[PDB]
């Protein structure tokens, strides 16, 4: 029977993520969110794309937290996308800490008592702090919950690379990790065109240093960037997010940078941190810890440090 | 080289547009508006998926008209959902004329000059009103223009039957022609499930006379239910242009029932209606006439004669 | 966890299904053929694949029958092509039946011992009379398996016509029942073209009545043309049978026609037939029962003869 | 209107090309051979796929040289698979070079009447000889003509490190370069795995340097391993052959290894070698040379060789 998967919270990405599931025929749909009728109004519009898809996923909006029965799959966008208050020019996710703390501890009840067998991709901001309060209060075992960080992150640096060198984007590989957030770590050695090392193109004139460090400042202002020209980024957040959740549903094994619970990778223990993982069947396969220098490794502990900050202040 | 697709309006459609493009590699995109910055946002944020979904589509903003110069098909979302003035309760298709007529012109005179040969999609309501009037000003050939309506309206129909007799979406099929509207004809006699007549269901008790009744009345009402509940259908009206898009693009010569200009089908001429038509390489291949008895044929009549009341209180 | 699809046979339909399971990534794939070490090279040649297709699904070879344990889905082709002895030209399923009778027994048993909850599609010929041999020899139920038939005889008429009227070759529905081979029935007035009865387009002199008989008589004799040109068709009866495996496999519940196990319906019992029925997870979901007139039933009836006559000369 | 793909051949690798164009809706085909009647058959089978695979290409058969007029891809697999009188032991692809020769001069001819603008691919071996003997032959720029190597080599490498690892087979990269055959050069310092070096892997005892080598060398044997169990390696080849069609086609540009004009790089000149390049809408748009070591540059010079002697022996 066809997989079911729970979307907890119904706004832009969650619109993307129900369309984008239809259309790859992935499993039935339910959009879950407190405001009233919404969430119905969508999945009825979502609905009948079934038709255009040759697809036949169930789609359902739903104001009741135990319609989590059942869900295989358990996608959490609930919460703040702005501090009520702060202007476009200043945001940041740090500032939505204090806005969607109490909201994780909520889902994550109801997420034990209906569903405790579910695979759990968190995508609330700040992501790395709001991942581990959700894995604390769910009560599933690490293997089965992980956040949206890496895979979204890395499609920017991808993309734009992509478009100096005139290659097909997916043909560009490159790590970002440690924290989703403006402390991200950008790792210039791990990255890769067609499998060659970016060095090489560099060496060749193709691409330059001057032109990768604007490269990467504007991928980790990219949110930012589309803030101060629309809004809050939704279709490649939903886009990341739906290619992790279906890699676990496919038993695909991916390697995928999602944030993940640390076990002493990288000095680290008792935190959730970015890094590249193996989705499959049984949710985190494998936590591959990357051989970082110590100047690299510097720039890891800045990132979890700033972690660690937030995750006191939700306390 | 890949094809252009210029997005004339980057509003909810347009952005669902431009995302199931990149889904499907279709070709390059150019979100326009007169909005500042906005559609740049949305592209920018847009172009990212071109890495998950192994594609390489350039998706950019534009608030110029010349972008136009090039394009190979035009989709024209453009104008407003809703008279501003107007409740949810009283929305009607037949208020938004006097808020979107001078549009079609504006954009009619752009296509002329910059893209005389590209084949044009209206979407912007009343929609069989607006597309003639694109059509007029734009000067391109009747093979090259239709208007969104038929795929639309017949996917909820279908989608709403499979759900009834638990089959395949796709495997429903049926006809709503005239007009998009609350004028829009539904022929019962041309409902099949698998290929087979809609009757033999109804004779077995698999579906009752009584049921179709009211998935009827849902379908011409459905616009509504969902603002009722939500906003303006998007999520669909977009998958339904780009199945129609991408059967111009790819010669697929699917037959899609669109707002085309009649010449004499139905008895009809000198106005565009909804009729099956089939959809390749040169456009408009085909245009077919369904053999309507005379009782669905004084149905058409009447969907005929609103598309006039408004095509004249448009000019 | 990935399905086990196990391929009993692993000669020309069975490669295509093994490579069409790679591109559509719909299972782990077992190649068991009687013939040594064969299978394991269209396996492995067949695994690399997966890198093109951007799959993740495992394809080994197998010489023993316990390989059977843990199939979801198993597809038998297993059998003889052609009586030893017969010319090309004197082709006939019929005279396969001395030759693959035995073979469905010898595989039921392995089924029922190793997958009795497996779902069974039946290939070799004559296929309606295989299938229900497999049947009562494998002992699983009713709903679980089923022969090819339907699909494939179809997909020529409706590609034929597709040829002649300009369309999608999907747009054009059909219905041939009864059995699959020379006494096939093809049901003229349940054709349409994009759900438009064909009458219409043979009113509009489209295509002609001539023009259909001629395109009924190819249909029948497809394979004997092809093997008048080249040998047994293989490409297209794969490309069948994974339709109706990957309906099981994602719960689509297309409507598709398939050998089944007719219980009262055109009068007939205890004897398989070819009618459309709904495949999804429960496997055959429903049989639909056309509401043939009496010219028809007669044919149908005809069909179900010659199947009960090859029947009693397999025991 | 669609592109027009000619296989020039319709053997084991020809059917497989035609079965995956229409799977992707990719363009018409014609399959020409030498063989009277044949390539008719597996047209026609082929055809009806495009019922279950919605797509609208036709396929038709060839006796007739001048077919390839309007080409805009032409497959060139024409010859001999072995040398008549040798075992399946002692093959080697050096010894079709007499075989095969002439047939690429007459092939040519008719390219540069019939076709001169058409992207040309090569796959008749000696691959590395037979394309320059063609590009000479045929007149055609040499970013219109490539050779099938790298990406069927790589698809083995990549395959079954991937096995060893538990991850997605695509997330292995893997560069082979010089020449398709027994002097093939892998770099093992160029292999990554989710873009990160293999070289980590190896440190942290995931697969070893001894398991390493084995995979070498089963890969330079592989398609022998093939043949010592069952036949001519075509599913992995024509699965490669399209992946580079499709790339162009669609100007994907995707960097894939394959056999082009070297004019300098690795200081080679007046020579066909294969190295990644980047195919898209203007063919081959980029030539990458690898930044090689003095040690892989011996091994690259060695293969090169090769083709030189046999180049040679072929005039
Ligand atoms: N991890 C990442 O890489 C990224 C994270 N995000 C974050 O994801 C979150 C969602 O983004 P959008 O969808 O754009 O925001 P949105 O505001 O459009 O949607 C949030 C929805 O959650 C609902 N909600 C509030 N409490 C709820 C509850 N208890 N249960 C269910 N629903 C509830 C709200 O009514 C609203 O509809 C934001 O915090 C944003 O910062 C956004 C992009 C990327
Ligand atoms: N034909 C059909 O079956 C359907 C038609 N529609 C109609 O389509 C239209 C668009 O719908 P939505 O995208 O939801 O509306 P929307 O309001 O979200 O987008 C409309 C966009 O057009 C822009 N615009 C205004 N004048 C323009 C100009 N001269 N050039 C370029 N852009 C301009 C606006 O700034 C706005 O961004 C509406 O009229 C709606 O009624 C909607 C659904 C179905
Ligand atoms: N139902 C339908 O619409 C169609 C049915 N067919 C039938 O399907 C059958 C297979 O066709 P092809 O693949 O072209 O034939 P094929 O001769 O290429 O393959 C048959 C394979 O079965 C193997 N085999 C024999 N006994 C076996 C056993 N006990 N267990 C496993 N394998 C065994 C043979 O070694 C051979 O490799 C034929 O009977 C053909 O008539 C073919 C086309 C359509
Ligand atoms: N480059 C690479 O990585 C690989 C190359 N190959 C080579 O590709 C070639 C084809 O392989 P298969 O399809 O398995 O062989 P095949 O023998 O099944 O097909 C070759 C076809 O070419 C036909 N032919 C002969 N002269 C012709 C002409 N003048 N015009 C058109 N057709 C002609 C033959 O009748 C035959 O049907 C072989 O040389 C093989 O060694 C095979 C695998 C990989
Ligand atoms: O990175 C993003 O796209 C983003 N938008 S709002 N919050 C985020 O993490
Ligand atoms: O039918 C629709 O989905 C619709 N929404 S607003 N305007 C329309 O025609
Ligand atoms: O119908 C066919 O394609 C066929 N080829 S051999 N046996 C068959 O039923
Ligand atoms: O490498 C191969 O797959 C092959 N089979 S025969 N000739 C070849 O190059």
Redesign the interface.
């Known amino acids: 029977?066809?997989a079911k998967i729970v979307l907890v919270g119904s706004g832009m990405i969650g619109?993307?993520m129900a369309?984008?599931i239809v259309?790859k025929?992935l499993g039935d749909v339910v959009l879950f969110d407190i405001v009233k009728?919404?969430p119905?109004?969508?999945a009825?519009?979502?609905?009948?794309?079934?038709?255009?898809?040759?697809?036949?996923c169930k789609v359902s909006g739903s104001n009741t937290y135990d319609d989590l029965a059942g869900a295989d799959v358990v996608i959490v966008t609930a919460g703040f996308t702005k501090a009520p208050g702060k202007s476009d020019k200043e945001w940041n996710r740090d500032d939505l800490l204090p806005l969607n703390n109490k909201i994780m501890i909520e889902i994550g009840g109801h997420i034990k008592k209906n569903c405790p067998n579910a695979f759990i991709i968190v995508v609330t901001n700040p992501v790395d702090v709001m991942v581990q309060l959700l894995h604390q209060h769910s009560g599933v075992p690490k293997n089965k919950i992980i956040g949206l960080g890496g895979?979204?992150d890395?499609?920017?640096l991808?993309?734009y690379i992509?478009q100096k060198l005139?290659?097909?984007?997916?043909?560009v590989?490159?790590?970002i990790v440690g924290a989703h957030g403006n402390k991200m770590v950008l790792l210039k050695r791990?990255?890769?065109?067609?499998?060659?090392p970016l060095q090489?193109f560099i060496?060749?004139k193709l691409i330059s240093d001057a032109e990768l460090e604007a490269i990467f400042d504007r991928t980790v202002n990219?949110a930012l960037?589309?803030?101060?020209?629309?809004?809050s980024?939704?279709?490649?957040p939903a886009?990341?997010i739906?290619?992790m959740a279906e890699?676990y549903l496919?038993?695909?094994?991916?390697?995928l940078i999602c944030s993940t619970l640390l076990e002493g990778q990288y000095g680290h223990s008792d935190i959730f941190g970015g890094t590249?993982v193996?989705l499959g069947?049984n949710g985190v396969?494998?936590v591959?810890?990357?051989?970082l220098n110590s100047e690299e490794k510097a720039k890891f502990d800045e990132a979890i440090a700033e972690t660690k900050r937030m995750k006191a202040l939700a306390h």
């Open positions: 029977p066809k619109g993307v369309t984008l259309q025929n009728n919404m119905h109004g969508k009825l519009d979502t609905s009948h794309t079934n038709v255009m898809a040759y697809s036949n895979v979204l890395t499609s920017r991808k993309y992509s005139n290659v097909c984007p997916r043909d590989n490159a790590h791990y990255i890769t065109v067609g499998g060659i090489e060496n060749n990219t960037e589309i803030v101060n020209l629309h809004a980024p939704y279709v490649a886009a990341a739906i290619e890699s496919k038993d695909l094994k991916k390697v590249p193996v069947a396969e494998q591959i810890e990357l051989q």
